[PDB]
Design a protein around this ligand. Structure first.
Ligand SMILES: Nc1ncnc2c1ncn2[C@@H]1O[C@H](COP(=O)(O)OP(=O)(O)OP(O)(O)=S)[C@@H](O)[C@H]1O
Ligand SMILES: Nc1ncnc2c1ncn2[C@@H]1O[C@H](COP(=O)(O)OP(=O)(O)O)[C@@H](O)[C@H]1O
Ligand SMILES: [Mg+2]
Ligand SMILES: [Mg+2]
Ligand SMILES: [Zn+2]
Ligand SMILES: [Zn+2]
Lengths: 310, 312, 394, 309
DNA sequence: CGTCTGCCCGCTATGAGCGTTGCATTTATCAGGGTTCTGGTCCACAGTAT
């Protein structure tokens, strides 16, 4: 292949490969797969792609784009990079440079939740006006495809349309504005919009590249925070004051939508598992909620730096 | 084997009256007298005693290949084989030429009002089947290459042009595939008639149903009389499909093909047929035979069969 | 191929006044005569008793093939099938010009591929449907063959040039395939005509959407009176989303095309029908009707008993023998005859020429091993045990 | 094929073969050619077909339809045989049954008779209604497809589908476009309809199987007709009275449609030639116009009988 | 004005390009097993009541 497009600012590599067949008139997905990759066994994935390296070979002459920049700038890897830990981050980085697709998901065990959900093609109708008036092109953006938030950190809700990524495995699809215009207002929650705005600057932060704590650092950080905060039992939780603060900060409907409904009655709760000794990595949502409810005036990067340094 | 020209002999049973296929077969024999026809033994017992040791060892090595002695359980099997072979030919009578006029006369008479009821024709439903079960080493094949060795294999009929293949024998494979059972039929039919069925039918890409509907068309041109399937144990979920299709294939085969079918297996192969009433109804259609080893005694006194087997 | 020239009758029904297809069919019998027509039995002879042992033992083995004794349900089935066959030709009269309008509607169904189109609105279908379910060994195949053996199948008409096919029988493929049910039809059609349609239609590269139309058109070129499909339970073991479209096509054909359809199946085949037709149910017979023995059981046993070839035979049947006969067999039709035949053959083989209870017990224990659990479950009478297994009574 | 539909009343074999293809659902014309005929290279001929042995073989089980009935009942032959001669007629009847397509056309000169055959399909609105009421079918008719006069004898004129038979030489086509109906009330003259009605009974004529005069008989009969009309002179012809009679009977504009115009100036006209020595075969129209002009007391069969007398 | 000289002319054989066909290959479907993964479960220990 002779003319592989450079990725736009804040774009997933899926959109770049999709445009690399619109720019040259390739219609059948098998021909595009045989040209770009050389195999017909590859699977299209939005977020955390594999088979990288052949993409870096096409962009070789433009010296800037290498495998590290593609991994850390045009994927969803920085959301999972710090929370997993130093042990598996390097293995996942090594694995994404070769032909192991599902092994990367297995190594990033937080993403290894077996079957996923909400694979419909999302978009934000307000950002597309800026995309068309600035570039002349429309493309998938990393803000839209957060793992569990169907919200835009600057405008609000996302307009879904019912086409699934897994509907056609080998097809790369590119957004078209004539098909796109199906905007209708929906219900909006300001608390989740604020959460999305809080969680957005993590993506474009260089600190997440080289800084990641471990499990015992996490539990020491949590126990020191609880002891200094003062709403604790004898080396244990009050189980009421922290939950009351969480309910004050966020409504029950928001947690029900986020699939993290609080369960006071049962002994097995995600918050309780967070407090107790860590045994497995947790998602970004739980850490973000804990940080926001317990540290109401500190940014994400500085909070992670405080958790990791000590 | 080989194309033996037919010579007809009358049969004393009324139902077998005028069928060339039934009459060309060897004559009926009594069950007691037929079991004694299978006996064989070595003729070198005293004349070859004084000779070199290597020749004597070479002679001794042929004992388990030419020594056969019938027991009391062979006469029942011989009777069942004879009845199964001869009774499946009644519906395949080739010599009829007055059917059209008789049928039309009956139709006219039932239409005018002279005759009230009539019966034109009726199709045949299902063929007899038998099951033989016993432990390995008990002699389920040595005792059946000799029951079927008193029949010709291929018989040529002068007035007609049919080559009556009296019987046919095939074996299952270790894989247990359902497509290698419909592919040994053509090979065993080619190794006897010297024909070219495997190239014409087997090698082309055909489904199992289409290739099973072709096995009942070349088993009708040649008036095949019996089909023996050996080592049926190897279908015990060995490979190639699920249990339900593995059980449906046999039922459809028995329903479709017109010839009788005999099955031989191991005591672990009754779990296949002991699953639903259709399979147990078709496997035991003409009785089921279970074989057991020789016992020293039955009631106090020692068995005479053991004495006669360990003395001859 | 019983190709016989046709002669036209004079029916009394006003609806069948000028239809050649209905007039060419043999006249319908009464309730009394239809039962007498179906009855058949082994002839036997006075001198057959005194012959050689082998000559007799080869004659006992002819009992199951040449014996039939119709019960009450067979007359009802015969009447229903006769009405279904005769009453479907009134919408396909060739003299008026109603068959020649179905054939024009069916050409565009081949061209378009959609089986709901039409050109003449006046064309109508007048066909019905039937369903039959019963436990194994009841006699759902031999009784159908005996009923349909009255009609002459292929009939040739002289004023026209058609060859009416009164009935046709096929069976479902074991694999559940959708392309094999449409090929068994062609095979069975050119077996009963001598033609070659499988090479015309099956060999060419056709999708199912057009084979299902070529099948239906060639079923109307020859005026096909009735189509019966045996072993319908094989449809369940098909590809996902494949069992439904044949179930829809078999009811499209009756409603639109006009070819009557009959289905035969095992009680395992109700789960693909009730979950997703007129149903008639068959069950094994029982001794006790309300509080007294059922006359049909005694009739069947007494008619079977007169076929013995034993030299020293009991004159009449004892009560205990009948009780043991019903206990071992448990009423199913197929096991009764085989048990009788096997017991008689052992009677000849042993030397004693009289059937006793111990002989019946010995033959049942030794020679019928694979069928033991099902009959034992039916004998237990526990609903949980009978509900176990498959292909047993509902 | 297994069963071949019997021909209807007054229908060409082309329609019967098309219906045979329709009934059994054979869409590809090549497969229909394989099923009906042995080979794939037989052409579809509308009017005067060949290969008429296999069709009679297909209809063999019926005791009615033989080759001879197919020649005269379902073909345009009856209006060619009486005007060509006995030897040529017998050779045509013998030869058209077997495998010969160009031979019969070359021998009868039908291709030479009309440089442009009326290959465009026809359709009669009123006849189709009676066919639908009676038979439930629509089929081509022999009255529609006259060689040069496109007028239905019973009523009006004929509309044209504008599709040509020569577009596909191997396809048999059936009239089934939901009986496409349109109004074309324009007519040239009722004399054309009268002439069509006059020539119509010639198609169904039992006596037309054997009547076929010779060239000498034709010229002596025409000389006798010139004598008994009295419009003849010594060793010449009147050359004007016959033209006046034809003009009275037939309008010139009407004759323009028939592609036959009288030319008094030049001596190649057919009106003088039909009274002169006969050296080449004449069509049915050239005789029929003279018949209607000079001798209207007799029909076509009676005129033929008198000429052969 | 008719047969020979020109004229017509239907016919026939040939080759390059386009449209169609049968076989082998790829693709899809389904059952079975399995092997680690993680998700809830019970046991022993620290701190509190008589
Ligand atoms: N009324 C009867 N009189 C005599 N024999 C009968 C009668 N009804 C059934 N039989 C016997 O029972 C058998 C008929 O059953 P089949 O022909 O095998 O069909 P089936 O009962 O439907 O079993 P399937 O088709 O496998 S579910 C034959 O052996 C007949 O001889
Ligand atoms: N009646 C018999 N008398 C002597 N030898 C016998 C007899 N029946 C079987 N055998 C011996 O048993 C051996 C093995 O039999 P085989 O064909 O392997 O039976 P299976 O295949 O059932 O094991 C044969 O070599 C044969 O010599
Ligand atoms: Mg063996
Ligand atoms: Mg059956
Ligand atoms: Zn936005
Ligand atoms: Zn008209």
């Amino acid at each position: 292949m002779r003319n592989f497009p450079v990725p736009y600012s804040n774009e997933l590599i899926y959109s770049t490969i999709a445009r690399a067949g619109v720019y040259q008139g390739i219609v059948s997905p098998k021909q595009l797969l045989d040209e770009v990759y050389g195999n017909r066994k590859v699977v299209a994935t939005l977020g955390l792609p594999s088979h990288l390296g052949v993409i870096a070979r096409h962009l070789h002459q433009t010296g800037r784009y290498a495998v590290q920049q593609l991994i850390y700038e045009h994927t969803l890897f920085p959301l999972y990079a710090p929370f997993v830990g130093k042990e598996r981050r390097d293995e996942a980085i090594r694995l994404m440079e070769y032909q192991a697709q599902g092994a990367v998901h297995l190594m990033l065990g937080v993403a290894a939740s077996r079957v996923k959900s909400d694979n419909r093609f999302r978009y934000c109708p307000d950002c597309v006006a800026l995309q068309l008036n600035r570039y002349g092109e429309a493309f998938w953006q990393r803000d839209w495809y957060l793992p569990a938030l169907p919200y835009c950190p600057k405008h609000g809700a996302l307009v879904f349309f019912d086409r699934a990524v897994d509907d056609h495995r080998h097809q790369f699809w590119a957004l078209g504005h004539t098909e796109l215009l199906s905007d209708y207002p929906k219900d909006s929650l300001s608390q989740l919009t604020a959460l999305a705005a809080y969680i957005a600057p993590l993506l474009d932060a260089p600190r997440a590249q080289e800084l990641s704590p471990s499990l015992e650092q996490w539990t020491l950080f949590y126990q020191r925070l609880a002891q200094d905060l003062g709403l604790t039992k004898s080396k244990h939780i009050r189980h009421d004051l922290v939950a009351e603060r969480v309910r004050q900060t966020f409504s029950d409907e928001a947690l029900e939508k986020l699939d993290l409904k609080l369960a006071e009655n049962k002994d097995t709760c995600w918050l309780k598992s967070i407090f107790r000794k860590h045994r497995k990595a947790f998602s970004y949502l739980q850490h973000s909620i804990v940080w926001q409810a317990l540290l109401p005036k500190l940014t994400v990067i500085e909070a992670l730096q405080q958790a990791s340094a000590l | 084997a080989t194309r033996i020209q037919a010579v007809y002999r009358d049969t004393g049973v009324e139902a077998y009256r005028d069928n060339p296929f039934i009459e060309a077969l060897p004559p009926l024999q009594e069950s007691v007298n037929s079991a004694a026809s299978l006996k064989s033994s070595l003729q070198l017992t005293s004349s070859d005693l004084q000779k070199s040791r290597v020749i004597r060892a070479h002679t001794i090595c042929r004992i388990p290949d030419d020594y056969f002695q019938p027991l009391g359980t062979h006469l029942l099997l011989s009777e069942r084989i004879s009845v199964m072979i001869r009774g499946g030919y009644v519906g395949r009578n080739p010599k009829t030429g007055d059917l059209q006029k008789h049928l039309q006369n009956g139709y006219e008479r039932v239409q005018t009002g002279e005759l009230e009821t009539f019966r034109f024709e009726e199709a045949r439903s299902t063929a007899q089947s038998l099951l033989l079960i016993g432990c390995s080493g008990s002699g389920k094949t040595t005792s059946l290459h000799r029951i079927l060795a008193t029949y010709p294999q291929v018989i040529y009929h002068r007035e007609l042009n049919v080559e009556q293949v009296v019987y046919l024998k095939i074996d299952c494979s270790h894989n247990g595939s359902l497509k290698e059972i419909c592919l040994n039929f053509f090979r065993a039919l080619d190794r006897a008639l010297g024909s070219n069925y495997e190239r014409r039918y087997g090698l082309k890409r055909h489904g199992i149903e289409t290739m099973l509907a072709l096995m009942s068309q070349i088993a009708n041109a040649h008036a095949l009389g019996l089909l023996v399937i050996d080592e049926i144990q190897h279908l015990s979920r060995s490979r190639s499909g699920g249990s339900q299709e593995m059980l449906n294939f046999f039922v459809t085969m028995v329903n479709i093909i017109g010839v009788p079918v005999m099955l031989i297996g191991t005591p672990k192969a009754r779990e296949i047929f002991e699953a639903d009433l259709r399979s147990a109804r078709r496997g035991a259609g003409f009785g089921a035979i279970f074989w057991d080893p020789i016992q020293q005694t039955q009631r106090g006194k020692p068995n005479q069969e053991w004495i006669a087997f360990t003395d001859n | 191929a019983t190709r016989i020239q046709a002669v036209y009758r004079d029916t009394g029904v006003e609806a069948y006044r000028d239809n050649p297809f209905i007039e060419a069919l043999p006249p319908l019998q009464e309730s009394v005569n239809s039962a007498a027509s179906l009855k058949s039995s082994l002839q036997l002879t006075s001198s057959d008793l005194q012959k050689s042992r082998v000559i007799r033992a080869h004659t006992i083995c002819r009992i199951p093939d040449d014996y039939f004794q119709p019960l009450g349900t067979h007359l009802l089935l015969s009447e229903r099938i006769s009405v279904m066959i005769r009453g479907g030709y009134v919408g396909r009269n060739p003299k008026t010009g109603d068959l020649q309008k179905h054939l024009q509607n069916g050409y565009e169904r081949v061209q378009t591929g959609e089986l709901e189109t039409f050109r003449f609105e006046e064309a109508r279908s007048t066909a019905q449907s039937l369903l039959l379910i019963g436990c194994s060994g009841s006699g759902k195949t031999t009784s159908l063959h005996r009923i349909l053996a009255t009609y002459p199948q292929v009939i040739y008409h002289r004023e026209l040039n058609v060859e009416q096919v009164v009935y046709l029988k096929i069976d479902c493929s074991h694999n559940g395939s959708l392309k094999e049910i449409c090929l068994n039809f062609f095979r069975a059609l050119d077996r009963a005509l001598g033609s070659n349609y499988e090479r015309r239609y099956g060999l060419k590269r056709h999708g199912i959407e057009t084979m299902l139309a070529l099948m239906s058109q060639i079923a109307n070129a020859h005026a096909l009176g009735l189509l019966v499909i045996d072993e319908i339970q094989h449809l369940s073991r098909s590809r996902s989303g494949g069992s439904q479209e044949m179930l829809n096509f078999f009811v499209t054909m009756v409603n639109i095309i006009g070819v009557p359809v009959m289905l035969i199946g095992t009680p395992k085949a109700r789960e693909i029908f009730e979950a997703d037709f007129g149903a008639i149910f068959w069950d094994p017979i029982q001794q006790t009707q309300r509080g007294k023995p059922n006359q049909e059981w005694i009739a069947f046993t007494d008619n079977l008993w007169q076929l013995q070839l034993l030299q020293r035979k009991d004159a009449l049947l004892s009560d205990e023998v009948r009780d043991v006969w019903y206990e071992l067999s448990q009423g199913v039709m197929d096991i009764v005859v085989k048990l009788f035949v096997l017991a008689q053959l052992r009677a000849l083989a042993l030397g004693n020429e009289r059937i006793t209870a111990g002989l019946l017990r010995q033959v049942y224990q030794d020679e019928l091993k694979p069928v033991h659990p099902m009959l034992e479950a039916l004998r237990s009478g526990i609903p949980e045990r009978i509900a176990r297994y498959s292909d047993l009574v509902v």
